[PDB]
Amino acid sequence: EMKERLGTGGFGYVLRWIHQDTGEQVAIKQCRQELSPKNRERWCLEIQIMKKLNHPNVVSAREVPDGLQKLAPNDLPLLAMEYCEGGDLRKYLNQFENCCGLKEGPIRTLLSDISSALRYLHENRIIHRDLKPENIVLQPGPQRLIHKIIDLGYAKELDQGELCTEFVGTLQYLAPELLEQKKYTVTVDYWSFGTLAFECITGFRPFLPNWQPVQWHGKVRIVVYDDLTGAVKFSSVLPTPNHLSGILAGKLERWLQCMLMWHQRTDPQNPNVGCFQALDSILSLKLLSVMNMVSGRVHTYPVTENENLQNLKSWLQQDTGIPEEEQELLQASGLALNSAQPLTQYVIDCTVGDLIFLFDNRKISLPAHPESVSIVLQDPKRPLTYTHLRRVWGQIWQTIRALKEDCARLLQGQRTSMVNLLRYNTELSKKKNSMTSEREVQALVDKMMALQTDSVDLQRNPTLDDLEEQARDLYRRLRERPRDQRTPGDSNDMVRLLILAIQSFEKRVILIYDQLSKTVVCKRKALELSPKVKEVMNLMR
């Protein structure tokens, strides 16, 4: 005897037999009934097929674990596999705080894994009829966490036969191809995968709220967005309230917008390669990211090796904005960019960081904030705010979260320009205690312990985070609200939390400028008042 079950899918059950002694991880697919006769053959088509080949984005076989081996409620064999450790991709997709879907890069991991998974399969003629976030494992990985496609109970071999013919479990996703039960080619995996990614980013699709058979002609009645009543929507042209970049929302609105349809949909502009290098190009892309401290804010760049600071400058120029000779470009803390070295060096993409960029002037202080439309009137009204606030309510804080991540990304946007002082200050401070032992000793320790004064104020200093926790709770106290009692058309609490997040993004903001400007005049007319004390407080001998 050995341990517990795992779940349903395909022609039967999956089992977790944690070995009696050695402690291996064994997972068995077994047949449900006797379910004869050609399915009795086709199950043995499958088993041989799942053994045939392997690669680290889909599981491999295991053979026979002789703790009992074949106990069985059948006169029919079994298939055994490796059990792995991070669960289903859904179990993760399910996380309370992973609301609003992903704002990730593990998305990246995901796509580029499942892609290389799927490719394999079609290169090997194995159209995996479906694809479930339920059939995918976020496997723990030492280098970078791994994805492994599973559950091959439903595939077309093309050359030897089919696998099942059932829609067992939860249909929910999948293409017309099988929904209409019509004739089909590979095109379907693109659907599943695409609609997988759509979820991987948003948490939804166009769409799943309205069940399925049943939405079968919410088939944009078609490449477009769609309608509501209060607030429902079934769209693929532009996703809503979730970050990833400003140019992977590129990808989406082009990658998804291609492979999310029926019968030959591939990117109409190009006889390229679909599931393939179409994705990986728009994936592998080397990303630069300038933060303009004029709070013209974020920029973003597709940079090679044949492009160094020289090239980077010209871009910052023609954006938002301003010419080249007022351009301080600080790599995190300290160093500028050095210099005729390709930008291919300062990107760094996911394992366990940013170009901030500054100006030469007096100081101006701009707020101006990110937002989503399906949040606009959500505060100025309690508008029959129905059962589903697992859209709005979550979104509330994910818009508040975005603000945190912004002040945060201006704390390290500004207090990354005061290390430009601390170094410059002391380098040009105590060089005047080795070359100041020597009469006009007036403007030596006077403009030294006064524009050290306007330097000591800022180097140790402390609402909004005290507010993230109040969001952290409520917009969780909904899933943690039982199946009953929920429904009353009620908004209320969220409103203030947003405005108080705004009432911080109007104090945290300008009073980072009373750190900024007090290090832009205390860097110029502090370290430019040195050349007339450097080698003017020298010639007296």
Ligand X SMILES: O=C(c1ccc(Nc2nccc(-c3ccc(Cl)cc3)n2)cc1)N1CCN(CCO)CC1
Question: Does residue 313 interact with ligand X by CB under 6 A?
Answer: no
Q: At what angle do helices 392-414 and 465-474 cross, to 10 degrees?
A: 160
Whichever of 14 and 275 has its CB closer to ligand X, that residue is 14
**In the complex, what is the shortest distance from the CB of residue 90 to ligand X, in angstroms, rounded to a whole number?**
9
- Give the nearest distance from C-beta 151 to ligand X in angstroms: 7
> Does the footprint of ligand X cover residue 14 (CB under 6 A)?
yes
CB-based contact 113:21 (threshold 8 Å): no
Cβ distance to ligand X smaller for residue 25 or 212: 25
The residue (of 88 and 280) whose beta carbon lies closer to ligand X is: 88
| 7 near ligand X, judged by CB under 6 A | yes
DSSP per-residue letters across 459-471: SS----HHHHHHH
Residue 131 interacts with ligand X (CB under 6 A)?
Answer: no
Please list, residue by residue across 449-459, b when 16 or more beta carbons sit within 10 angstroms of its beta carbon and e when fewer do: eebbeebeebe
Find the part of the chain contacting ligand X (CB under 6 A) among 83-91, 342-350, 424-432, 459-467: 83-91
**DSSP E strand stretches across 253-353:** 287-288, 290-292, 297-298, 301-302, 328-331
Smallest CA-to-CA distance from 163 within 40, 325, 16, 68 is with: 40
Q: How far is the CB of 84 from ligand X (least distance, A)?
A: 3
Q: Which range binds ligand X by CB under 6 A, 64-72, 78-86, 278-286, 425-433?
A: 78-86
Shortest approach of ligand X to residue 105 CB, angstroms?
21
Q: What is the DSSP letter of 301?
A: E
266, 274 contact by CB (below 8 A): yes
Kindly tell me which of 29 and 391 has the beta carbon lying closer to ligand X.
Answer: 29
84 binding ligand X? (CB under 6 A): yes
Q: Which stretch binds ligand X (CB under 6 A): 77-85, 212-220, 302-310, 328-336?
A: 77-85
Q: How far apart are CA 117 and CA 112, in angstroms?
A: 9
Please report how close the Cβ of residue 88 comes to ligand X at its closest, in angstroms.
4
CA distances from 335 to 229, 331, 339, 347, 353 (A): 55, 6, 10, 16, 13
Stretch in the footprint of ligand X (CB under 6 A) among 84-92, 438-446, 483-491, 526-534: 84-92
Closest to ligand X by CB, 14 or 258? 14
Determine if 146 is a binding residue for ligand X (CB under 6 A).
no
- Minimum CB distance to ligand X smaller for 65 or for 161: 65
6 binding ligand X? (CB under 6 A): yes
The helix/strand/coil state of 5 is strand
Q: How far is the CB of 80 from ligand X (least distance, A)?
A: 7
Helix (H, G, I), strand (E, B) or coil at 349: coil
Three-state secondary structure string covering 239-268 = CCCCCCCCCHHHHHHHHHHHCCCCCCCCCC
The identity of residue 389, as a single letter, is: L
Give residues 17-46 in contact with ligand X (rule: CB under 6 A).
Answer: 27, 29
Total number of residues that touch ligand X (CB under 6 A): 13
Out of 87, 161, 250, 342, the residue judged to bind ligand X by CB under 6 A: 87
Measured from the CB atom, the residue of 118 and 421 that comes closer to ligand X is 118
Under rule CB under 6 A, residue 342 binds ligand X: no
Instruction: Point out which span in 82-90, 277-285, 299-307, 506-514 binds ligand X (CB under 6 A).
Output: 82-90
List the strands of the sheet with 297-298, edge to edge: 297-298, 290-292, 355-358, 328-331
Q: Is 94 or 257 the residue whose CB approaches ligand X more closely?
A: 94
2 makes contact with ligand X (CB under 6 A): no
Q: Which of 17, 43, 83, 234 binds ligand X (CB under 6 A)?
A: 83
Query: Could you tell me whether strands 290-292 and 297-298 are parallel, antiparallel, or unpaired per DSSP bridges?
Result: antiparallel
Query: Taking CB under 6 A as the rule, does residue 49 contact ligand X?
Result: no
Give a three-class secondary structure readout of 485-514. Answer: CCCCCCCCHHHHHHHHHHCCCCCCCHHHHH
Pick the closest to residue 300 from 283, 312, 308 (CA basis).
312
User: Whole-number minimum distance, CB 91 to ligand X, in Å?
Assistant: 5
| Distance separating the N- and C-terminal Cα atoms of the chain | 97
By the 8 A CB rule, do 138 and 89 touch? yes
137 touching ligand X, by CB under 6 A: yes
For the CB of residue 139, give the shortest distance to ligand X in the complex, in Å. Answer: 7
- Counting every residue written for the chain, the total comes to 541
Closest CA to 407 of 490, 463, 341: 463
Closest distance between ligand X and the C-beta of residue 235, in Å? 30
Which of residues 14 and 400 has its CB atom nearest to ligand X in the complex? 14
- E strands, 122-174, are 136-139, 146-149
**Choice between 81 and 355, CB closer to ligand X:** 81
Q: How far is the CB of 7 from ligand X (least distance, A)?
A: 5
Residue 88 to residue 332: CA distance in whole angstroms: 37
| Residue from 13, 56, 65, 91 binding ligand X (CB under 6 A) | 91
Stretch that binds ligand X, among 6-14, 301-309, 455-463, 524-532 (CB under 6 A): 6-14
Name which position in 93, 126, 150, 316 contacts ligand X (CB under 6 A): 150
Residues with a catalytic annotation lie at 130
**Tokens 């917008």 belong to residue:** 257
**Would you call 141 helix, strand, or coil by DSSP?**
coil
Using the rule CB under 6 A, which residue among 88, 280, 454, 514 binds ligand X? Answer: 88
The tokens for 55 are: 């690669």
For tokens 């818009």, the residue is: 399
**List of residues contacting ligand X (CB under 6 A):** 6-7, 14, 27, 29, 81, 83-84, 87-88, 91, 137, 150
